[PDB]
Amino acid sequence: DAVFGDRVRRFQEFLDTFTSYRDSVRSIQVYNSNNAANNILPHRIIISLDDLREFDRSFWSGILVEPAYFIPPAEKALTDLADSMDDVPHPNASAVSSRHPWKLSFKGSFGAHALSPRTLTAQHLNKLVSVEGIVTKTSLVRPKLIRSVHYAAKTGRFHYRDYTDATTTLTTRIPTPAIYPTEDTEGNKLTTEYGYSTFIDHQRITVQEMPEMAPAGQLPRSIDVILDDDLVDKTKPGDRVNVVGVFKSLGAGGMNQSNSNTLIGFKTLILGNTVYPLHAARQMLTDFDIRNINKLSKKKDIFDILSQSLAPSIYGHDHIKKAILLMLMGGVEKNLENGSHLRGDINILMVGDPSTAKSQLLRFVLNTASLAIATTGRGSSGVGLTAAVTTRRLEAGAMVLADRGVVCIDEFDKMTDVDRVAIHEVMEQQTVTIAKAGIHTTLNARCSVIAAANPVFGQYDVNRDPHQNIALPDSLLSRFDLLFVVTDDINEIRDRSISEHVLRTHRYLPPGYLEGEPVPKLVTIPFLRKYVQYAKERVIPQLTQEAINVIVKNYTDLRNDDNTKKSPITARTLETLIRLATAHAKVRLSKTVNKVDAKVAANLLRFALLGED
């Protein structure tokens, strides 16, 4: 028993020596105390396991090899530190007896104890381990009783008692029957005070080895993990995750009398102490990034620099690159006070001859957008592309999964008519609605669509109408903001330029390799992703009178002047002008749309629509 006190003292010395943990305690406390007077941060701290090694090796190896005897006193000492620091007076009834101490978490240098579900072995029981894999199942969240409070009617005295179960504590104790006491030691009838009692959250999950590591087509192996309090619901199935915790056993293992002749083994678990994700998308900016982004935005022609830095390995097609950049920035989504909604996201279609880089260019967006789903037009059904029924439960399709993202559709011309018509809602109302046996529900699908197709005659025929070359209904083409036609026109200097370009491309060697070993200015893509993220989060350009003066004139002329234009012109064309102008102003990091943005947007729409600039 006496050893527990000395371990508390020794961890107190550690906490006094390495002062960056005191600042963490105090900052969480003052933050919580501020907003309480008007979200709340958890009572949890993460310690570097390296600091503890350099402070005291005997305590470090104790935490790492005998956690049941070292983690509890260390955690107790942390609570005393946080409790001795100043705190708000006159606590309420529930605060006075919360039964809520602070809790620890760990990072850095696990050494031999960094494992995977295949290799976790009986030698590692009762050690502190780190495992990696994929989440496959998650239980429902449930509350769990740990303490109850009672008021004695006659004497006016408040009583209480505590409960334990094998997964609630690192050390082992006699189990408790989960009964509520009805009567006092002195015969007084008792009452139960809910709201003063304490309950905590509980959730079980399962983690499996990654399929990339599975040997010989053999069955994969997995472990169950226990989570509670703050750790609940921070994961979902399909997540790649790294878990830290104590590996432990449970139950009687059939030695309490059973028919098995004790051939069956004991049960085992990992008690979740800390959870970290794995990147397999998001980035977080440093101060230097904000400075560089703001400085670069004042160049005369940022749009050209950024657009030409998209897919530099593809020669030509300047305007399609500019259109893709404006798509990645997007417009501004409006919700009016009466609940009415106005669309913000831009859709693009491109149709053309064989081999003209359509699929290759479409592939680039999938590797620079923060959320992107890819599909081929014939490998997907209307229900699979939007939503389907199962058991009643309703299951999402690809357009519902990419909600605030982009969806790429290749071989669009092969999609059947029965499949295409499921998409007409999603590209304007940005919702999916189902009315089938036992179900009625609406779902959100706010994404931007980009797609590629082949013309009807196998190559584009200029001697026939665009409707004859493009077999799609007018109501569908109207929903694409920009429609691009592209062809392989044979010419000497064009052929020479392209061929020399691809040959220069095929002579690349990566930096760390000798020759023959197997494996203007352009901003790098890892910087362009930060630029796009920053611009989409921090600036929301408002429209201006000077921009409107250009938009109205262009729309009425473009609609009323008779020309051989390749797409129907409708009330949706006006919105395309507003969206494109807003997106260009956003590239420029401007707080307002100006005459320049409207002019550029008009000059892009005119090129795509009327084929010439």
Ligand X SMILES: Nc1ncnc2c1ncn2[C@@H]1O[C@H](COP(=O)(O)OP(=O)(O)NP(=O)(O)O)[C@@H](O)[C@H]1O
- Beta strand 128-138 with 198-208: parallel, antiparallel or unpaired? antiparallel
For 181, which DSSP code? P
| Given 33, 109, 258, 283, the residue binding another protein (CB under 8 A) | 109
Between 109 and 487, whose beta carbon lies closer to another protein? 109
Report what 96 binds from another protein, Mg ion, ligand X, none; CB cut-off 5-8 Å by kind.
none
- For residue 359, the minimal CB distance to Mg ion (Å) is 3
Cβ-based nearer residue to another protein, 194 or 288: 288
Minimum CB–partner distance for residue 514 and another protein (Å): 11
Strands, E assignment, 35-178:
44-48, 103-107, 128-138, 142-152, 158-162
Partner that binds at residue 291, options another protein, Mg ion, ligand X, none, CB closer than 5 to 8 Å by kind: another protein
In the list another protein, Mg ion, ligand X, none, the entry touching 119 (Cβ below 5 to 8 angstroms by class) is none
Based on CB atoms, which residue is closest to another protein, 262 or 294? Answer: 294
Distance CA 567, CA 581 (A): 20
Q: For the residues of 499-542, what is the DSSP string, one character each?
A: HHHHHHHHT---TT--TT--------HHHHHHHHHHHHHH--PB
For the CB of residue 6, give the shortest distance to another protein in the complex, in Å.
Answer: 6
d(CA 131, CA 116): 5
Q: Given candidates 262, 359, 441, 505, which one binds Mg ion under the rule CB under 5 A?
A: 359
DSSP state of 173: -
- Among residue numbers 568 through 597, which ones bind another protein (CB under 8 A)? 591-592
Among Mg ion, another protein, ligand X, none, residue 388 binds (CB under 5-8 Å by kind): none
Beta carbons of 600 and 550 less than 8 angstroms apart:
no
Q: Which amino acid is at 335?
A: N
Range 27-38 burial, b when 16+ CB lie within 10 A, else e:
ebbeebeeeeee
Q: How far is the CB of 109 from another protein (least distance, A)?
A: 5
Distance CA 194, CA 76 (A): 27
Total binding residues toward another protein, as defined by CB under 8 A: 21
Task: Tell me the closest approach of the beta carbon of residue 54 to another protein, in angstroms.
Answer: 9
Based on the shown chain and the rule CB under 8 A, indicate whether residue 504 belongs to the binding site for another protein.
no
- Sign for the pseudo-dihedral over CA of 559, 565, 567, 573: negative
Residues 6+ apart with CB under 8 A from 467: none
Distance of CA 510 to the CA centre of its chain: 31
Nearest to 48 by CA among 77, 94, 15: 15
The span from the CA of 381 to the CA of 420, in Å, is 9
- Residue 315 interaction partner, one of Mg ion, another protein, ligand X, none, beta carbon < 5-8 Å per kind: ligand X
3-class DSSP state of 399: helix
Return the residue of 161, 291, 299, 464 that touches another protein, per CB under 8 A: 291
Q: Which stretch binds another protein (CB under 8 A): 103-111, 124-132, 300-308, 421-429?
A: 103-111
List, as residue ranges, the binding site for ATP. Answer: 352-359
- 3-state SS class at 73: helix
Task: Please report whether residue 294 would count as binding another protein according to CB under 8 A.
Answer: yes
Query: Is residue 262 a contact point for another protein (CB under 8 A)?
Result: no
The one of another protein, ligand X, Mg ion, none whose footprint includes residue 61, by CB under 5 to 8 A per kind, is none
In the block, residue with structure tokens 């409708």? 570
Comparison of 52 and 452: residue with beta carbon closer to another protein: 52
Question: In whole angstroms, how close is the CB of 311 to ligand X at the nearest point?
Answer: 9
Sequence-separated (6 or more) residues with CB below 8 Å from residue 592 = 541, 542, 543, 544, 585
Instruction: Give the number of other Cβ atoms within 10 Å of residue 82's Cβ.
Output: 18
Do 442 and 431 meet the contact criterion of CB atoms below 8 Å apart?
A: yes
Binding residues are 352-359
> Pattern of binders to Mg ion over 311-350, x per CB under 5 A?
----------------------------------------
Considering beta carbons, is residue 152 or 285 the nearer one to another protein? 285
Closest-approach residue to Mg ion (CB): 359
3-class DSSP state of 611: coil
Residue type, 61: S
Length of the chain: 613
Instruction: Please tell me the number of Cα atoms within 13 Å of 136 on its side-chain side.
Output: 15
**How many residues bind to Mg ion according to rule CB under 5 A?**
1
**Kind of pairing, strands 190-192 and 222-228?**
unpaired
* Shortest reach from residue 298's CB to another protein, in Å: 9
Is 111 a residue that touches another protein (CB under 8 A)? yes
Contact in structure between 154 and 225 (CB atoms under 8 Å): no
Question: Is 334 a binder of another protein (CB under 8 A)?
Answer: no
Among 116, 7, 136, which Cα is nearest to 63's?
7
Task: Name the pairing type of β-strands 240-250 and 198-208.
Answer: unpaired
Minimum separation from the CB atom of position 542 to ligand X (A): 39
Residue 112 binds: one of another protein, ligand X, Mg ion, none (C-beta under 5 to 8 A by kind): another protein
What are φ and ψ of residue 394, in 5° steps? -110, 130
Smallest separation (angstroms) from another protein to the CB of 290: 5
**Stretch of residues binding Mg ion (CB under 5 A), selected from 324-332, 355-363, 474-482, 582-590:** 355-363
**Which parts of 217-285 are beta strand (E)?**
222-228, 240-250, 267-277
Binder among 23, 86, 186, 287 for another protein (CB under 8 A): 287
Task: Name which of ligand X, Mg ion, another protein, none residue 498 binds, using a CB cut-off of 5 to 8 Å depending on partner kind.
Answer: ligand X
Tokens at residue 599, please? Answer: 């002019």
The answer to whether 50 contacts another protein (rule: CB under 8 A) is yes
The binding site for ligand X (CB under 6 A) comprises 314-316, 354-360, 454, 498, 502
Q: Which does 591 bind (CB under 5 to 8 A by kind): Mg ion, another protein, ligand X, none?
A: another protein
Output the CA torsion sign for 556, 560, 565, 571.
positive
Mask: binding to another protein, 529-558, rule CB under 8 A, as x and -?
Answer: ---------x---x----------------
**Residue closer to another protein, measured from CB, 445 or 581:** 581
Query: Cβ atoms within 10 A of the Cβ of 564, count?
Result: 8
Q: How far is the CB of 303 from ligand X (least distance, A)?
A: 21
Of residues 93 and 509, the one with the C-beta less far from another protein: 509
> Which of ligand X, another protein, Mg ion, none is residue 538 near (CB under 5 to 8 Å by kind)?
another protein
Binding site for Mg ion (CB under 5 A): 359
> Which residues form the interface with another protein (CB under 8 A)?
1, 6, 9, 13, 50, 53, 108-112, 285, 287, 290-291, 294, 511, 538, 542, 591-592
